[PDB]
RNA sequence: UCUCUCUCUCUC
RNA sequence: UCUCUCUCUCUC
RNA sequence: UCUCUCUCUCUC
């Protein structure tokens, strides 16, 4: 059944929206002030800090960073008769914790929290990619397209586990491997137990994310090493390099800024009644009638800023430029020639140069974001029955496709990773960059509500460049 | 997190400084005497001898060199009413070992020891380059710029492993190869095991230091030889010759003399509270308000001595003269016309000719010393994505950059070193001596604390000579 | 080398 | 990820 | 699945 999940997501988004309304009430902000991305970012990171129990518990035992008992940050921006001002106002954790407490009818709202962490992951992935950590681990910065949800902490649950990508998991595993190489953390203490439990859980998440059998079995053989040394390091690097083409269907949750949700909730559009979806038309239908303001530097182009924020909202920073432009309706500028900077504003930059303006979010078309992979993998490995069932009682043979039956079982168990690298490189060679994917699907029009008739895109515009980076 | 490392380095430097204060207390030296480079050198080499367990353990079984149970050296210089005197005072190992024992709150202070070895490496590299060992190994003395940390012993840890350079590792590997050629040390005894363990660890350090993939794979194929004969000898020589241009980002730790640290600690500038950094502005900000005295021969120019000691402190002996002068503010004299000698003073030279004077260390500007390489390598091999991730569930192809996918994996494994020498010489030909490096970075002013605005240097002063040697 | 291996971000 | 990993079905 | 999982029988 899908009605229950729809009601649950509608309920928790209604809670988030009415929390945002409560914030707009308590901050004494004007109508325009509540349509700002920056203040939503500030309050939302404040919520992240308040609800992150582990960092807090690390902090009350560590009274450092000067003024840090329980209050952090808070750069609220207010419009003064056309000009702008920034104030560093500090808020307690317990008060706003309880404001959430009645902002969700007595619940913890963990799903909402995961929504905020995921929307932060999308903003960071859209703005800045961490080539720095990649090169730190020795890992090639050519594969930044594997950095989905890198800024996410491990505190996120299964819903948060859905969005964090393959390459980010390679990075976090490499971090723990380097730590275990530096010192003997693998002893029989409770620390070793929690490390191996986390390691096996993360490997299970990995094997869930992949699609082809060969990579799944190689990963299953990865955690056989009770004492991970150096071989699994290049094993995981090659895992990422092979997942370049055999990508895992991780997630692309379409999280939206708190201002848009709050404006919708304030207008009386209760999400529980008509339902809410995070994947279909629904996150789209709020945006063509949404007004968003933000601050811009006197050199930044607002036209680029609108495209970038729509990227971040729809987590399309790692999507191809051609289809993103087709859905948007206008050409999208790659990261190479963007005359803009990060949407976050520095704490030291001067107050005079900021100017507020409206953000354009309307898009001509819409499409469903499925958590799947390209059809090319199913082209490499076709589909069909392998077994048969006797319906009539007739004296006949039972046809069994035996050579694939051994392949599923792997009768002769794989010796090491290398034998798997062999046929996975063979599959990579079988791959082609002209393999059309997602057959039977298309882009629909905004007037469509039940996905009745799509239109297939056709891109013949030479080599404009399907690479947002470079 | 960077606060913990900052606190740790501040703590161990505070320990070193208060050890230096304890030494100034116990030596009964005057105020000027503690501002001398020579006495700091003597006590510091004494500490090196006391804390070097391997040489000690080689020595108590070898009672040679006459008076050598546990006491070595100690040429302390004292000012007598304007004149100078030198005394050979001998100190025990255990007493000063325990003085360190409470000089660091009960710790071994291995990081501090590594700091002293690295600062010795910088002094030796600044003063004298070992062309002698290069020619001994048959290795061309044109490449002395690869002699970073040559005097370092193998006892230094990972922090010490960071600073010892590529050419020095070529030299130590050549030494072990010559030893294994002379006699069959590669037998199945425990000695062979420790040799191969050290050899593979040092090769791992090498492959960590390099940047380009081709050299890394060639090095990975280097240790495939279970019995190293003669081919890997020219293989490593060519490795150094290729690393001439494709240099490895080894390290340039800015270690400072114990007198400067001790003066700062005595004044009450506790490093733990405000933090310490070895790489940023911090090692610089102590020096413009630091007073240093040293002995000089009646022919040596003190102006050259100040520049040389600032070179040694900042380990800029292998940096280009133009930028070093720009940061210093005054022209730097190359090794060709330096009317000075080594900062260490001979044990046989007469007492009458020594004269003490102040050392100039103040510099107009400051810059960050990153452990990176020139941008020219990234110009030869550009940057960008290689793989893509499906965000929307659309029937579409997954574009994979296959020809580089084989290149990362090396599907057809390299036959020997020669096929790699081919394209590495091709890359050397692609190299140009006009490739501007370190884009997006610059030199900042001393008034800057957060690296807000740099100024890019522009050198058009013909051919003054960017070669400290020759 | 988490005081910056490149596309730039105060954000640890 | 039950708003679609492929053969297409409004059927939850 | 008593309209036949093997040695064959209309026998219920």
TrEMBL record, chains A, B:
Gene Ontology cellular component terms for the protein in this record: helical viral capsid; host cell; host cell nucleus; ribonucleoprotein complex; viral nucleocapsid
Motif Bipartite nuclear localization signal, chain ranges: 178-196
Modification after translation (UniProt): Late in virus-infected cells, may be cleaved from a 56-kDa protein to a 53-kDa protein by a cellular caspase. This cleavage might be a marker for the onset of apoptosis in infected cells or have a specific function in virus host interaction.
GO molecular function, one term: RNA binding
Subcellular location: Virion; Host nucleus
BP terms from Gene Ontology: symbiont entry into host cell; viral penetration into host nucleus
Primary location class: virion
Record key words, sorted: Capsid protein, Helical capsid protein, Host nucleus, Host-virus interaction, Ribonucleoprotein, RNA-binding, Viral nucleoprotein, Viral penetration into host nucleus, Virion, Virus entry into host cell
Pfam families hit by this protein: Flu_NP
Subunit structure: Homomultimerizes to form the nucleocapsid. May bind host exportin-1/XPO1. Binds to viral genomic RNA. Protein-RNA contacts are mediated by a combination of electrostatic interactions between positively charged residues and the phosphate backbone and planar interactions between aromatic side chains and bases.
Record family assignment: Belongs to the influenza viruses nucleoprotein family.
Role summary: Encapsidates the negative strand viral RNA, protecting it from nucleases. The encapsidated genomic RNA is termed the ribonucleoprotein (RNP) and serves as template for transcription and replication. The RNP needs to be localized in the host nucleus to start an infectious cycle, but is too large to diffuse through the nuclear pore complex. NP comprises at least 2 nuclear localization signals that are responsible for the active RNP import into the nucleus through cellular importin alpha/beta pathway.
Protein name: Nucleoprotein
Species in which this protein is naturally found: Influenza A virus (strain A/Wilson-Smith/1933 H1N1) (Influenza A virus (strain A/WS/1933 H1N1))
Gene, per the UniProt record: NP
């Amino acid at each position: 059944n899908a009605t229950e999940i729809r009601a649950s997501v509608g309920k928790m988004i209604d809670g988030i929206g009415r929390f945002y309304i409560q914030m707009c009430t308590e901050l004494k902000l004007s109508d325009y002030e509540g349509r700002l991305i920056q203040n939503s970012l500030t309050i939302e990171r404040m919520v992240l800090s308040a609800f992150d129990e582990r960092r807090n518990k690390y902090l009350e035992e560590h009274p450092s960073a000067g003024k840090d008992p329980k209050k952090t940050g808070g750069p609220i921006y207010r419009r003064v008769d056309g000009k702008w001002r920034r104030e560093l106002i500090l808020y307690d954790k317990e008060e706003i914790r309880r404001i959430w407490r009645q902002a969700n009818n007595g619940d913890d709202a963990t799903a909402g929290l995961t929504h905020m962490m995921i929307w932060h992951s999308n903003l960071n992935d859209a703005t800045y990619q961490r080539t720095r950590a990649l090169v730190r681990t020795g890992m090639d910065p050519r594969m930044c397209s594997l950095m989905q949800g890198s800024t996410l902490p491990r505190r996120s649950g299964a819903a948060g586990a859905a969005v964090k990508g393959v390459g980010t998991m390679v990075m976090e595993l490499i971090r723990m491997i380097k730590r275990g190489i530096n010192d003997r953390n693998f002893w029989r203490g409770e620390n070793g137990r929690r490390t191996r439990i986390a390691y096996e859980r993360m490997c299970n998440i990995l094997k869930g994310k992949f699609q082809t059998a060969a990579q799944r079995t190689m990963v299953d053989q990865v955690r056989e090493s009770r004492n991970p040394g150096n071989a699994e390091f290049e094993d995981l690097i090659f895992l990422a390099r092979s997942a370049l083409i055999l990508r895992g269907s991780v997630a692309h949750k379409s999280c939206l800024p708190a201002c848009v949700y709050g404006s919708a909730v304030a207008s009386g559009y209760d999400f529980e009644r008509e339902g809410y979806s995070l994947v279909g038309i629904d996150p789209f239908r709020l945006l063509q009638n949404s007004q968003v303001y933000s601050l811009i530097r006197p050199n930044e182009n607002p036209a680029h800023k609108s495209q970038l924020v729509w990227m971040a909202c729809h987590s399309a920073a790692f999507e191809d430029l051609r289809v993103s432009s087709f859905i948007r309706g206008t050409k999208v500028v790659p990261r190479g020639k963007l005359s803009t900077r990060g949407v976050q504003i520095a704490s030291n930059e001067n107050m005079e140069t900021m100017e507020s303006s409206t953000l354009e979010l309307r898009s001509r078309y819409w499409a469903i974001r499925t958590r799947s992979g390209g059809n090319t993998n199913q082209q490499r490995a076709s589909s069909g029955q392998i077994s048969i069932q006797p319906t009539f009682s007739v004296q006949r043979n039972l046809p069994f496709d035996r050579p694939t039956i051994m392949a599923a079982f792997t009768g002769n168990t794989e010796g090491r990773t290398s034998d798997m690298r062999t046929e996975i490189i063979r599959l990579m060679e079988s791959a082609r960059p002209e393999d059309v994917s997602f057959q039977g699907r298309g882009v629909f029009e905004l007037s469509d509500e039940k996905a009745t008739s799509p239109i297939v895109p056709s891109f013949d515009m030479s080599n404009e460049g399907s690479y947002f980076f470079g």
